[PDB]
Design a protein around this nucleic acid. Structure first.
Lengths: 521, 104
DNA sequence: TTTTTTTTTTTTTTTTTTTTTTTTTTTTTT
DNA sequence: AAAAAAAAAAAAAAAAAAAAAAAAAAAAAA
């Protein structure tokens, strides 16, 4: 007999009763939700206890994406887009009184209100992350600006009072999944959010760093222009120290996640060049105490006079040391080189810093690559050449003809892989790295560079191609290698006999950054 | 696609069609899984190959299904799944044989 | 004897193509 | 006579499919 009732007091007993049975794939789920919203109408003799259970079942009868039927999602959320005016009069103040009683003291580990606070935050997260609600909200901006208060309080609830591991994780997962701000928050309304990424209550329980670094991903791909304008805060304050302290104070998951954030900024920042030059300023010009908070420096494995001269240790030095232990101690050759890559690109994309590659204080980065290339593993030897794609891109896109001997010096260093592989021409992998590199040089200097004039070509010729071919190529007994190395010449003159596109075509300079790189086609 | 036709071809009877069909339907699957059982395939192909088991009618079709289902269940005892989808690989018997004891 | 990488799959985002609205302007009732 | 309706004819928004990219898991090398 069906008489549990959708409303009144009969449905939720004082701790459970949800409804994941016949309401899974069925519309009648409606009356549990619209029921619960009616129970939230103040009164608060019997209805105060039952506030814990209603926001519990809301996080239970909600579906995932369900590719099998994206319409059961569409139809369940179509109740909320009608009920929404009611959610805003009650669930916002019911969150606020639960928050502010959790923002008045220190001992406040009270299991009634703190177990409710997490359940009401999940309920809002699942409302915001639903993209169909985001397109629908544009129909009424009165509700957008009422709802905007969630962020206005959440931003205080990270850097004030006793924000607990659970309270932080619920607010960060919300801001990772939110999607809402892209169409409803202005760039300046978002800066108060990024302003918290540096300022969080400290408990490096691994849980908390893992979600903190994943938030930076969602914010880079959904808010790039905003993240880059502010990079001088969140990168040196809370991301960059995570790698430097080492694996022991953390877990390898944390270290890898803080390497991925570097690659994402690289795939969204060459778009803007960093004309503010934040990169070289906050990392290679500046020492530790100018940009790293004490919050991470007290946890740092210091060594010698460097501990008393934090005024002199520029961040590039301590980074260069940590990369050295991965190759020589752990054998983590990939982690060392994929990291090393991302910094060199971002640091030197500035159309005057490209020349700093020539400096002896900076050649320690090439030495560090050489110490990887002397290792046994053929895949490691190939990969320590596969990285040079950035060195081509910086030297051949952001270059200025004016510094004639500067250009010539960069173009000479760019042949260093051929000097390393010359004795190793016997090995399959050592032959292949020559081709992969050289495709990227040719492509970037001539196919994707529009600005060739006369003057750029002369630098790219009797100072570049002639020193490549006379001093390396005309000395390899490997005939099948030479066949490919001379095929690139036919392509540039007018015989395009190199498949081009059969079935299974690169033109913008970003294309050389890719894992396959570039081909003859 | 062809396994859909392997079911409904007896709508027009002809035991000459059946007599070659059941013989070829055995040798089709004898080599389909020559490599040592992918974990993912033990759920991917498993899921769509059960989304359409009817007609529940058609007496001369279910003869062919009962003759093939235990040919599969024979290798499911010999060199099945080296762990992973153990549990779902026997749910194949639970709903398929429910049909074969409701309309026979 | 177990670590590391590649094909199958998943997702974003172009690039086409379609959906759709809103300005424009004659002849009769406000 | 003035304001309102009636109809040409340009204009603007957004979802699909496939390439890449990237993940799970599977294929390879210890």
């Amino acid at each position: 007999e069906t008489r549990v009732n959708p409303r009144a007091l009969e449905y939720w007993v004082s701790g459970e009763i949800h409804g994941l049975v016949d309401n899974e794939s069925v519309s009648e789920f409606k009356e549990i939700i619209e029921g619960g919203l009616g129970i939230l109408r103040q009164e608060s003799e019997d209805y105060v206890a039952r506030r814990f259970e209603v926001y519990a079942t809301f996080n239970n009868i909600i579906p995932i994406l369900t590719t099998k039927n994206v319409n059961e999602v569409d139809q369940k959320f179509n109740i909320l887009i009608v009920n929404i005016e009611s959610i805003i009069e009650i669930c916002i103040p019911h969150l606020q009184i639960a928050q502010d009683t959790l923002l008045s003291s220190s001992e406040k580990k009270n299991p009634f209100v703190i177990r409710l606070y997490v359940q009401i935050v999940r309920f809002f997260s699942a409302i915001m992350s639903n993209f169909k609600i985001v397109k629908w909200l544009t129909k009424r901006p009165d509700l957008v600006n009422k709802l905007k208060v969630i962020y206005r309080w959440t931003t205080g609830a990270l850097r004030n009072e006793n924000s607990n591991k659970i309270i932080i994780t619920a607010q960060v997962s919300f801001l990772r999944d939110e999607k809402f701000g892209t169409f409803f928050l202005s760039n300046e309304e978002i800066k108060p959010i990024i302003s918290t990424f540096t300022e969080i209550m400290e408990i490096n329980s691994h849980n908390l760093i893992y979600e903190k670094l994943l938030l930076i991903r969602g914010f880079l791909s959904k808010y790039p222009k905003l993240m880059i304008e502010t990079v001088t805060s969140w990168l040196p304050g809370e991301v960059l120290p995570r790698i430097i302290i080492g694996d022991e104070i953390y877990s390898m998951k944390i270290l890898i996640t803080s390497i991925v954030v570097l690659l994402e900024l690289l795939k969204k920042c060459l778009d803007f060049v960093d004309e503010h030059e934040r990169i070289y300023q906050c990392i290679m010009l500046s020492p530790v105490c100018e940009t790293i908070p004490e919050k991470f420096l007290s946890k740092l494995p210091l060594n010698s006079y460097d501990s008393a001269n934090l005024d002199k240790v520029t961040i590039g030095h301590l980074l260069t040391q940590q990369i050295k232990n991965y190759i020589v101690v752990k054998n983590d050759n990939k982690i060392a080189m994929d990291l090393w890559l991302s910094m060199t690109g971002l640091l030197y994309d500035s159309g005057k810093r490209v020349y700093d590659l020539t400096s002896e204080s900076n050649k320690v980065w090439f030495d560090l690559n050489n110490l990887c290339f002397i290792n046994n593993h053929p895949k490691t030897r190939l990969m320590s050449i596969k990285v040079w794609r950035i060195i081509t891109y910086c030297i051949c896109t952001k270059i200025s003809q004016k510094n004639q001997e500067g250009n010539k010096s960069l173009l000479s260093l760019l042949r260093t892989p051929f000097q390393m592989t010359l004795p190793y021409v016997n090995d399959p992998s050592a032959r292949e790295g020559i081709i992969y590199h050289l495709l990227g040089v040719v492509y970037t200097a001539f196919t994707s560079n529009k600005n060739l004039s006369t003057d750029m070509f002369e630098l790219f010729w009797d100072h570049l191609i002639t020193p490549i071919y006379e001093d390396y190529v005309f000395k390899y007994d490997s005939i099948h290698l030479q066949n490919v190395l001379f095929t690139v010449l036919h392509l540039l003159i007018g015989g395009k006999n190199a498949d081009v596109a059969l079935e299974r075509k690169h033109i913008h300079p970003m294309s050389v950054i890719a894992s396959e790189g570039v081909k003859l086609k | 696609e062809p396994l859909l036709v392997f079911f409904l071809n007896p709508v027009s009877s002809n035991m000459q069609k059946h007599k070659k069909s059941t013989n070829m339907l055995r040798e089709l699957v004898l080599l389909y899984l020559t490599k040592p059982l992918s974990r993912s395939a033990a759920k991917k192909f498993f899921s769509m190959l059960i989304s359409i088991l009817p007609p529940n009618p058609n007496y001369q079709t279910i003869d062919m299904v009962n003759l093939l289902i235990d040919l599969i269940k024979s290798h499911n005892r010999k060199f099945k799944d080296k762990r992973t989808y153990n549990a779902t690989l026997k749910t194949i018997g639970k709903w398929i044989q429910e049909s074969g004891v409701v309309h026979q």
